[PDB]
Amino acid sequence: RFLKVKNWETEVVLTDTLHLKSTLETGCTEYICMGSIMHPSATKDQLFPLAKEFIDQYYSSIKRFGSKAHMERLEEVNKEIDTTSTYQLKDTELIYGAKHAWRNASRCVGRIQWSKLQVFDARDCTTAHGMFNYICNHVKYATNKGNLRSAITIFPQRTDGKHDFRVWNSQLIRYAGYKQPDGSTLGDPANVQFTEICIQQGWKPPRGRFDVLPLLLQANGNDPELFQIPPELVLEVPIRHPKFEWFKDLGLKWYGLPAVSNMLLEIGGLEFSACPFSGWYMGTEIGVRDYCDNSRYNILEEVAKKMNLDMRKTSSLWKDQALVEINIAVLYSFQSDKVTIVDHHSATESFIKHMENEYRCRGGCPADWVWIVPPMSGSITPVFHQEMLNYRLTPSFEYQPDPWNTHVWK
Amino acid sequence: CPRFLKVKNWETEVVLTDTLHLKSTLETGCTEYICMGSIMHPSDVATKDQLFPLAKEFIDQYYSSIKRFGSKAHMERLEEVNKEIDTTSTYQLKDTELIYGAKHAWRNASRCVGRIQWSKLQVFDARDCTTAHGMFNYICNHVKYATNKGNLRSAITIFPQRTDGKHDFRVWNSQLIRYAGYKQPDGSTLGDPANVQFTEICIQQGWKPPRGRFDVLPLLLQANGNDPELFQIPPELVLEVPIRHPKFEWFKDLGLKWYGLPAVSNMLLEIGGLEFSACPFSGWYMGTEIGVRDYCDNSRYNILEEVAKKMNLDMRKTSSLWKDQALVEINIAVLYSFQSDKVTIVDHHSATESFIKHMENEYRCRGGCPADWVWIVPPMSGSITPVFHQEMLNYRLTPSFEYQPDPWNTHVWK
């Protein structure tokens, strides 16, 4: 059928036809919705229909469906799956598939940018040293002295599952986390385990609060190897506040480049298990989640202290007050350092505009309300009032198992 | 469907196991290929063949609840219901079953963060009501009991079930207490813009509007499928709270107030296939319902700008977060004014913490707890509340509260 989505603030109705093209499952059924579940539950035979479908939509997108180039490309892929059990994408197809995996990422509020993506082909890579070189060039290009630029680097596809390329870091730039003897945690508590894997592999930790983790890089299914990203490539921002001059004394910083490195890029049945991709931050990612999650840096108490807020009852809303000031500081600091950052009002604003674009030109836009709505001030942003349909289009970004639970060590 | 489904809390790592979903009875709107979990409203009476298994399902569940499943009272009740449907094509609930069904409709309400209270619900049986004047008496008694001078008590008043669909009891009000909205010729709106359509109906029905910013609407009550009739709620029964701020002495100069009793009156209560089309129920407020939605939605009272101006905030850039700063202070004022006047209210931190504890107990004792994350997470400060990090499963258990068409869209005027 045709499905309608209403904005309850604007009363704008959009009509979704694009959902007719999905085939992956969402995890819901007619009787149970799993919309808030974070991770809901090849061969030559499985591969050609998937390859065919992707080649078909590629040649439909450059408006040459059924052309001679389309016909030969289909046969070319057929012979290649036959005689090698896989196939290799053309450069144009690799670029098209990467942009469309971003376009289809239902959890990303930043997709108005989807077609401006720099795609680095790293499929000639064979070693962890080559991976490091490719990743350093990615970081340097995408950082661009603070004028951040979207980028993805694509390493060789999975073959037999035994020669996977993997970036073991979940993101290219993170801070370490250390278990203290007295039971508390120094640095980033979310990274205590990965940090401990780096230490076990020979990393000499400085045991500070903001230690950039080394890259841990696995090429062709071999043991991963450690590398230190050159510090001049890692842009960082000291967090200060435009009105509270004591805020700089908290000693807070963050890195400028958000770069997801633990996901799987699927294009036409091919699986790119190592595809680090990066954009720029929405302020709440740092200011709400990284700093104020109870399992993360957990600074609300300290800020509420220096703000002298009444902290004896929840109904004083002291946490909400300190939350807003922290997120003012983050935005103010990146902006003062001319480092690209978007606030959640602008980003959600852009996303509503992007949805309108997509419904008009494409017939819909898959979107995960649970992830799109920012983690603070939800209903004063326009996406809170926007109904969204969620569905899985391919090419896509997918989760995959953490490598340390799979890898057969040597 | 699989027998066990697991939900994780990503902040605490607690994993819970759900088996109650195997009892889900109706459709969510999702499919295997599309999820409709953010659609507000996804998707003539019941025949004898439809009614038999729906009643048995409910009667079994009631007798299971009192540890008399399979007993002689259970089999005799099954038989009496079945004979009553056969001869009259409907049946009547016992007082005990009515109370049980209403409490469990709340218990099953996936969008309600307040369900830790579900078993403490005063049920007013109003199935003997025949006229709109009597509906008015019943609703007044409900409002006075539930308000309780500010020490609010949850309550539901249940009016006669649907018969042929042409004799429905309906409260035309969507909530028992709401403020009027008036469209001006110049396009601006006075009062509550959400209620302009309903206010116009009341004016047409004969209501004389005071044309103020906080005018309590009259009740528009439909008995037995007749044309609805207007009644004014006695103002001494409508408890209200002037909104002042503990620090900002100028906040009281804004002239804001709100009513104490949230009372939903447009929903349908389904118990064992019976349809109670008029079942007003009330609890107490979570502060953000007033402080965030009623006051700061753009299409509502929309005070963020004016509070920001008095706060002397940089309003040129969105990235100063002036909107977020003002929103917090408005919600501080709402909670502070309700507490100072000793009117029951709950902040979004206490409510979500309570709901996590409730959800955990339901998983342990009942095998699950259906919950709609999109509705459970508060509209401000989402991730600093525990429900944000809590995976939830959503499904439709019966007894339930359901939406129904607005009655001015279906009523056949006499």
Ligand code: HEM
């Ligand atoms: C350019 C500016 C961008 C902005 C402002 C932005 C914003 C966001 C935010 C706030 C999230 C939620 C992140 C979280 O809570 O962990 C997200 C998720 C995501 N983004 Fe974007 N993003 C951008 C660029 C990109 C790019 C370049 C890609 C890929 C080519 C991408 C793909 C994704 C994916 C797959 C997710 C979901 C990740 C997951 O499921 O864990 N985004 N984005």
Ligand code: HEM
């Ligand atoms: C006693 C304290 C209660 C609290 C703190 C509470 C809290 C809430 C809140 C904050 C919402 C979201 C409302 C919205 O955003 O429009 C809600 C929804 C709901 N509540 Fe509760 N509630 C309470 C009592 C009750 C009672 C007594 C019932 C029924 C007997 C009930 C049934 C529901 C239902 C059905 C909804 C969904 C309404 C809809 O879909 O429009 N609640 N509740």
Ligand SMILES: CNCC#Cc1cc(F)c(F)c(CCc2cc(C)cc(N)n2)c1
């Ligand atoms: C359940 N969440 C797990 C997580 C996470 C996580 C941790 C990080 F360090 C990090 F940089 C990110 C970035 C997410 C992201 C990606 C992109 C491309 C842009 C953006 N603006 N944001 C995500």
Ligand SMILES: CNCC#Cc1cc(F)c(F)c(CCc2cc(C)cc(N)n2)c1
């Ligand atoms: C866009 N949704 C339509 C709506 C609405 C709406 C309007 C109101 F005036 C109002 F009081 C409520 C109360 C909801 C509610 C109910 C109960 C029992 C307790 C509580 N704490 N809250 C809901």
Ligand SMILES: C[C@H](O)[C@H](O)[C@H]1CNc2nc(N)[nH]c(=O)c2N1
């Ligand atoms: C589109 C979206 O579902 C809609 O705005 C919802 C979001 N969550 C909500 N949550 C509550 N409690 N109440 C609401 O009215 C809404 N509105």
Ligand SMILES: C[C@H](O)[C@H](O)[C@H]1CNc2nc(N)[nH]c(=O)c2N1
């Ligand atoms: C349980 C729930 O699915 C989980 O907490 C989600 C909620 N929404 C989110 N939204 C974003 N953007 N990022 C997240 O990590 C999460 N976490």
Ligand SMILES: [Zn+2]
């Ligand atoms: Zn769903």
